[PDB]
Amino acid sequence: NHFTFGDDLLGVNSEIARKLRQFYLEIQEEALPARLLELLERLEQAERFGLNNA
Amino acid sequence: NHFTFGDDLLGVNSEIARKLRQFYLEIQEEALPARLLELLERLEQAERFGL
Amino acid sequence: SLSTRIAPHLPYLRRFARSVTGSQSSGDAYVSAMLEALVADISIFPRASCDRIGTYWLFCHLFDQEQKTSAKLSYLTPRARQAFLLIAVEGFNEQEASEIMNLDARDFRKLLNQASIDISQQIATQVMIIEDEPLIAMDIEQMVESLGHQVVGIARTRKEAVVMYHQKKPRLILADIQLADNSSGIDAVNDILQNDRIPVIFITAFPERLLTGERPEPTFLVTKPFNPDMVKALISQALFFKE
Amino acid sequence: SLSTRIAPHLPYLRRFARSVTGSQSSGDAYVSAMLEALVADISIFPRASCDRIGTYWLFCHLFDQTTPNIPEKLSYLTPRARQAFLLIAVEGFNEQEASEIMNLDARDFRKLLNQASIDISQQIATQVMIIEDEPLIAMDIEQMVESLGHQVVGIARTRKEAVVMYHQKKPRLILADIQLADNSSGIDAVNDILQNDRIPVIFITAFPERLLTGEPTFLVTKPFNPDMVKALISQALFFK
Numbered sequence: 001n002h003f004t005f006g007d008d009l010l011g012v013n014s015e016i017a018r019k020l021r022q023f024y025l026e027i028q029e030e031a032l033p034a035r036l037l038e039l040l041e042r043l044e045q046a047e048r049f050g051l052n053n054a
Numbered sequence: 055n056h057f058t059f060g061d062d063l064l065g066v067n068s069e070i071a072r073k074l075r076q077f078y079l080e081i082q083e084e085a086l087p088a089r090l091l092e093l094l095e096r097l098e099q100a101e102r103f104g105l
Numbered sequence: 106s107l108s109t110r111i112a113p114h115l116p117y118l119r120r121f122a123r124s125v126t127g128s129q130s131s132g133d134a135y136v137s138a139m140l141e142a143l144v145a146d147i148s149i150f151p152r153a154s155c156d157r158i159g160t161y162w163l164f165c166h167l168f169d170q171e172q173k174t175s176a177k178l179s180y181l182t183p184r185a186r187q188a189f190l191l192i193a194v195e196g197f198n199e200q201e202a203s204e205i206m207n208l209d210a211r212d213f214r215k216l217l218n219q220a221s222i223d224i225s226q227q228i229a230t231q232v233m234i235i236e237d238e239p240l241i242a243m244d245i246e247q248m249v250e251s252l253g254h255q256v257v258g259i260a261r262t263r264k265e266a267v268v269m270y271h272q273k274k275p276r277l278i279l280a281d282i283q284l285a286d287n288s289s290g291i292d293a294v295n296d297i298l299q300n301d302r303i304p305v306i307f308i309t310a311f312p313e314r315l316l317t318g319e320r321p322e323p324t325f326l327v328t329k330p331f332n333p334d335m336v337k338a339l340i341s342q343a344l345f346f347k348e
Numbered sequence: 349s350l351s352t353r354i355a356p357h358l359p360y361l362r363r364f365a366r367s368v369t370g371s372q373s374s375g376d377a378y379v380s381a382m383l384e385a386l387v388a389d390i391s392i393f394p395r396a397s398c399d400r401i402g403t404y405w406l407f408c409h410l411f412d413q414t415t416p417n418i419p420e421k422l423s424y425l426t427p428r429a430r431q432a433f434l435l436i437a438v439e440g441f442n443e444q445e446a447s448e449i450m451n452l453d454a455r456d457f458r459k460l461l462n463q464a465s466i467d468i469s470q471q472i473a474t475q476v477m478i479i480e481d482e483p484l485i486a487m488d489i490e491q492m493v494e495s496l497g498h499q500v501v502g503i504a505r506t507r508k509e510a511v512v513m514y515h516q517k518k519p520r521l522i523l524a525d526i527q528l529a530d531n532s533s534g535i536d537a538v539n540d541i542l543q544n545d546r547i548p549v550i551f552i553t554a555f556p557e558r559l560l561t562g563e564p565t566f567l568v569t570k571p572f573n574p575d576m577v578k579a580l581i582s583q584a585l586f587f588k
Contacts, residue, residue, distance in 0.1 A: 001080035017437035112355030323571030330564030
């Protein structure tokens, strides 16, 4: 893993780390919810048309 | 898992799938490379200007 | 924009592309080409169920037009590989994966069946069983053969196991640690393992005397070697996630 | 745009938020708050080492400004300790990157991380019974268990001794050798105990010294059904 260095640093909690990584991977929806999509869209608008940048 | 239905359908290869998921998770850099970021910018511009 | 809509799927798409092609550089070249195609003509992005499906649809549509894992998945046809990975890694349901590959439901399951058979066929090998209790040995025999493996023989003693090993050259051993009234099963494995490094699974029956009705219960006991670091991490993991 | 630059980090950031807050709806509310503050004033995005670092830096900044650093799954850790642990354990950052994200110097981050690990182990420290008749094995297990901060309530050498010790001491974890003396009454002992209460058990014994040269030193046993055995075989062969 590119997690191997981090795992060695966590000692006896290395398998806790690994199972947590598996847990989050398996329960998280791969798509962003509508609200975060909308916010990205506003961020793009703020950037393009907003009064706080040029 | 939101993989449990998927693992069931894959029958005897369910642990193979689990291990592959762990492998791809462990080996992938979390940041998108510069070339893909540049393309996202050009795609944004292309839609913005209708290019 | 389409760009902000696609961007959060790219981590997932890049994994898919890497797993389908066998490397990050091939993976990323295909994802690149897909984005170049959209820069050139944004109209090729489909009206699919949702943006994730739409992005993977486009990737697969354009596609068709570590060493160990790639070696094995590369034996599948590109399409069977895609189907298997969409389910196995990418987290799609069947309805979604089939929409992505532009297949109806039956055809998508046929591809999955093909992937499954092709994987099993690739790893089918010759197996020796070390087990003196006949009912247990036959149960393991049946299980192993159901996977396409060839049982080359059932060895009942340490001496039979070593003789059989050399006459038959199995590539996998399922071994009971206990034979007769001693732990000669692990000795037999140790003798064999100086000859060759071959995978071994230590296995025996879960004792019937502890089985009842009215719950799913186990049938076998599988034993693995651990070092102290692994034991301590296991204890911590078991308590941390305790049911 | 900053928006296309931030978007590919959001799947990872949402995972981090979820893991730190304990829930997706709370993790998402914090990610939303970060995006809201950027929409209101885009100039707050840091000019940092890289976009991934700057995104997490901003998230942790906003998070720390709105979250008392007191404990309530890692909810028994302080929020800062759980951030330090998760940045390493789950998020894949190295120590230098994690410390930069948390605005800590190297020594403060190391301390925070080490304390988080200690606190995890202390949180799960418990009363442990060992069932093992061979004293050298039993002491090897006892030392591993005590090094985790557990208390060994006793070492039972027979089934009868184990059942009685179980009721007298009420251990919350059993480490059991299936084999005792010339028999397999270790598994029966565990079975007797488990009709009383549902407690974690790990079946363990030593790897025979006669087979070692100089390697594995323990054997751990687990119950399997036929499907699991078939999956294990296939997995073992696929990755050979």
